[PDB]
Amino acid sequence: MISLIAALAVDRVIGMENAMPWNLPADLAWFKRNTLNKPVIMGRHTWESIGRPLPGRKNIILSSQPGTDDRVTWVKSVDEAIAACGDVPEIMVIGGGRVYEQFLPKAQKLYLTHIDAEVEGDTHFPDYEPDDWESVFSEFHDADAQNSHSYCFEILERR
Amino acid sequence: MISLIAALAVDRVIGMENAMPWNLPADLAWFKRNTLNKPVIMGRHTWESIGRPLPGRKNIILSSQPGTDDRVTWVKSVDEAIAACGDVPEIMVIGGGRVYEQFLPKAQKLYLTHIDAEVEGDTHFPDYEPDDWESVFSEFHDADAQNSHSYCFEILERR
Ligand SMILES: COc1cc(Cc2cnc(N)nc2N)cc(OC)c1OC
Ligand SMILES: COc1cc(Cc2cnc(N)nc2N)cc(OC)c1OC
């Protein structure tokens, strides 16, 4: 099935700028934990922004432009992206905003990190209509030495 | 013992403006649940802002000015406020920022609502040094019909 995994600042803002509120080591450990040994689909900006292949995962870049790295798979369509995942229990869509948009209607599961931090972004995680989605897990953490804002992991399943 | 209970927007902003992010019915049910059959200490602005006595609780207003309502107790000092609570298991300090400030060093427990909402306030909940405080409970809720932002209840105990 298709899952989206995303880090949200307040007002559901997202961004892939390296250091920021998107550098939270705890968010990156949670990302790693929930994507290892799964295919990841990402848009080109998310690929540029991570700037290396994610090891232990098949990396699929959805882009209208031709590929510039042979260590990952490049595709032009959401159907091509899905087909390149093969027969697997779970496909992980890892951003950015355009990619989240085109995969949400097909997704059955959301892994969200609510980061208790203010960013101006103008680029938002898409509108998951609460009537369509059931929260099944949440886990709050305080700010600590490594993690300079509080955050909350949430998993939602589609009804 | 002395507890603080407070609603925080991002950056630990607080405010007592009626409708706002401080109108969250769920935050008000949680406030009621955790303060019923306890004394409440508040500053004058919090008293003006609530604009009625809280029933089922002894209401103590800490103010340098003389009292203007006989249904509540008025005092001039934190010691006077504490003494007017009598022998009770738990004293609840309900704001505002000046009152939170002068009671934090004496508090052993914090009831915080983290509201996932942006407000400009310039008036902040005080710095609870994470090394002094242990989170023992947290409970995330999604935005719903009644509650127009996600929120998280947290209880911390002093080490
Ligand atoms: C693995 O490294 C990164 C991964 C991501 C995507 C991402 C990060 N966190 C969460 N929860 N969901 C995601 N989709 C974003 C990044 O930039 C902030 C990364 O930089 C290290
Ligand atoms: C009982 O009514 C109110 C109470 C408060 C204080 C308050 C409200 N919520 C929380 N969690 N802590 C508090 N100290 C603040 C208020 O204004 C927003 C109230 O208006 C109804």
Numbering used by the authors:
A (entry chain A), B (entry chain A): 1 to 159
Sentences from the paper on this structure:
Two plasmid-encoded dihydrofolate reductase (DHFR) isoforms, DfrA1 and DfrA5, that give rise to high levels of resistance in Gram-negative bacteria were structurally and biochemically characterized to reveal the mechanism of TMP resistance and to support phylogenic groupings for drug development against antibiotic resistant pathogens. TMP is a selective inhibitor of bacterial dihydrofolate reductase (DHFR), which catalyzes the NADPH-dependent reduction of dihydrofolate (DHF) to tetrahydrofolate (THF), a necessary step for the recycling of reduced folate cofactors. Trimethoprim resistance in Enterobacteriaceae occurs almost exclusively through the acquisition of plasmid-associated dfr genes that encode intrinsically insensitive DHFR enzymes. Expectedly, all three enzymes form the stereotypical DHFR fold with an eight-stranded β-sheet, four α-helices (B, C, E, and F) and three catalytic loops (the Met20, F-G, and G-H loops).
Crystal structures of EcDHFR:TMP and EcDHFR:NADPH:TMP, determined to 2.5 Å, and 3.0 Å respectively, show that the binding affinity of TMP is driven by electrostatic interactions between the protonated diaminopyrimidine ring and Asp27 as well as van der Waals contacts between the trimethoxyphenyl ring and helices B and C (specifically, the side chains of Leu28, Phe31, and Ile50). Furthermore, the antifolate adopts a nearly identical conformation when overlaid with chromosomal DHFRs from other prokaryotic species, including Gram-negative (Coxiella burnetii)57 and Gram-positive (Staphylococcus aureus)46 organisms. In EcDHFR, Asp27 forms a critical electrostatic interaction with the basic headgroup of dihydrofolate-competitive inhibitors. Specifically, the EcDHFR:TMP complex displayed a stabilizing shift of 13.9 °C compared to the apo form.
